[PDB]
Design a protein around this motif. Structure first.
Motif, mmCIF file in Angstrom:
data_model
loop_
_atom_site.group_PDB
_atom_site.id
_atom_site.type_symbol
_atom_site.label_atom_id
_atom_site.label_comp_id
_atom_site.label_asym_id
_atom_site.label_seq_id
_atom_site.Cartn_x
_atom_site.Cartn_y
_atom_site.Cartn_z
ATOM 1 N N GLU A 163 0.826 -1.196 0.000
ATOM 2 C CA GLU A 163 0.000 0.000 0.000
ATOM 3 C C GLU A 163 0.875 1.267 0.000
ATOM 4 O OE1 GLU A 163 -3.247 -0.067 -0.129
ATOM 5 O OE2 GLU A 163 -3.725 2.040 0.243
ATOM 6 N N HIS B 281 -4.384 -2.446 1.398
ATOM 7 C CA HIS B 281 -5.339 -2.011 2.402
ATOM 8 C C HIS B 281 -6.722 -1.840 1.749
ATOM 9 C CE1 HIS B 281 -7.511 0.555 5.196
ATOM 10 N NE2 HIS B 281 -6.716 0.064 6.130
ATOM 11 N N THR C 37 -9.728 -0.321 1.950
ATOM 12 C CA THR C 37 -10.186 0.810 2.735
ATOM 13 C C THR C 37 -11.706 0.879 2.702
ATOM 14 O OG1 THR C 37 -8.146 1.944 2.111
ATOM 15 C CG2 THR C 37 -9.897 3.289 3.120
ATOM 16 N N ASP D 266 -10.393 -3.286 5.809
ATOM 17 C CA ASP D 266 -9.268 -3.263 6.737
ATOM 18 C C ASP D 266 -9.433 -2.017 7.612
ATOM 19 O OD1 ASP D 266 -8.190 -5.617 5.610
ATOM 20 O OD2 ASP D 266 -7.061 -4.466 4.152
ATOM 21 N N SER E 138 -8.997 1.437 9.923
ATOM 22 C CA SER E 138 -8.435 2.752 9.634
ATOM 23 C C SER E 138 -7.120 2.943 10.379
ATOM 24 C CB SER E 138 -9.436 3.859 9.973
ATOM 25 O OG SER E 138 -9.840 3.749 11.322
ATOM 26 N N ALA F 128 -4.504 2.179 7.934
ATOM 27 C CA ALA F 128 -4.615 2.771 6.604
ATOM 28 C C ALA F 128 -3.492 3.771 6.352
ATOM 29 C CB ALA F 128 -5.955 3.478 6.468
ATOM 30 N N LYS G 48 1.026 -1.612 11.519
ATOM 31 C CA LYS G 48 1.801 -1.555 10.287
ATOM 32 C C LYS G 48 3.116 -2.265 10.549
ATOM 33 C CE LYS G 48 -0.301 2.729 8.457
ATOM 34 N NZ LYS G 48 0.068 3.999 7.726
#
Ligand SMILES: [Ca+2]
Length: 321
Positions: free
Chosen positions: A71, A116, A118, A130, A132, A135, A166
């Motif tokens: 991403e 991701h 979103t 997925d 936030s 994100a 992440k």
């Protein structure tokens, strides 16, 4: 006496205990399972052919290559899922946002997710959006659970121990990173480590929710319009068997195995026909004498069947020179 073995799968015995499907391929010299190459519309999986007993510990120790894109950095996807399912052996989750977990019912697991999603995936995807909190760019790891309909939800929380996060080390270059899933059968604590980063959670709630204590393991990856080379390297997987029967073929005089013990694996409640291998033993100069089923309570000598339980069973067939 031996009903359920503690097995260690390694690169040399992998094909004996596990099965690749779809686009997945295996290199036995390196222990590398390639689940997808870096190409469109791939799906590949490896599944373990015996149920894992969660009343005992289990451990995967190996490496993972998540690819070179993710991403915000090229068009990478979909990610790799590691799923534990109360459903039948050999089943795998779906491609795309399900990340190999969505599509299995009341399952739980962990994913490394490079794409991701979103906006909300459609109904067929079997996945919620997925979160936030992951994100905005970068691949992320998370626990995942599915509901009774197989819909996947990425797990989040207010805790640094188990929240989706992440990845500290982003997959820019097709580098295999240390990956470990460690599970404690007493405390029900599952610990996942990827490239120095840890997630850990007591999974007793997900286990109880699943309706069972033993599980089908699958490792699954896919590509869509977004792609990546996605690989898992053995490494080892250690576990204790559930829903098996051991069948021994023993010299009645010596007490020694005449041919190697055989393990039948199935689902809980599955009725499995076992073979006394009479003809084969005859060819070795052996005649059937008797049977000892005292370690298999479900054994039916008329039909030559056992019914798999949560634990192991053992049947011994005796033969004479
Ligand atoms: Ca995703």
């Amino acid at each position: 006496a031996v009903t359920a073995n503690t097995i260690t799968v390694n690169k040399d015995n992998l094909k004996q205990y596990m099965t690749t499907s779809g686009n997945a391929t295996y290199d036995q010299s390196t222990g590398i399972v390639t689940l997808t190459q870096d190409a469109y519309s791939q799906k590949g999986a490896i599944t373990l052919g015996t149920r894992i007993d969660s009343n005992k510990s289990f451990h995967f120790s190996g490496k993972v290559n998540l690819g070179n894109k993710y991403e915000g950095h090229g068009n990478g996807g979909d990610g790799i899922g590691f799923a534990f399912s109360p459903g039948v052996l050999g089943e795998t989750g779906l491609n795309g946002a399900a990340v190999g977990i969505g599509g299995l019912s009341n399952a739980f697991g962990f994913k490394l997710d490079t794409y991701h999603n979103t906006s909300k995936p459609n109904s067929a995807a079997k996945a919620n959006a997925d979160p936030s909190n992951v994100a905005g760019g970068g691949a992320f790891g998370a626990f995942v659970t599915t509901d009774s309909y197989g819909v996947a939800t990425t797990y989040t929380s207010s805790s640094t121990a188990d929240n989706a996060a992440k990845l500290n080390v982003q997959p820019t270059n097709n580098t295999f990173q240390d990956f470990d899933i460690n599970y404690n059968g007493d405390t029900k604590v599952m610990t996942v480590k990827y490239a120095g980063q840890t997630w850990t959670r007591n999974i007793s709630d997900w286990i109880a929710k699943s309706g069972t204590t033993n599980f089908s393991l699958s490792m699954t990856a896919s590509t869509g319009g977004a792609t990546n080379l996605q690989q898992v390297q053995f490494g080892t997987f250690e576990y204790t068997e559930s829903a098996v029967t051991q069948v021994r073929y023993v010299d009645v005089t010596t007490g020694k195995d005449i041919i190697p013990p055989k393990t039948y694996s199935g689902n809980v409640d599955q009725v499995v026909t076992i073979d006394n291998q009479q003809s084969a033993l005859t060819a070795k100069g052996y005649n059937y004498t008797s049977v000892d089923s005292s370690y298999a309570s479900t054994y039916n000598d008329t039909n030559k069947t056992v019914k798999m339980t949560n634990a192991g069973q053992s049947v011994t067939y005796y033969f004479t020179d």
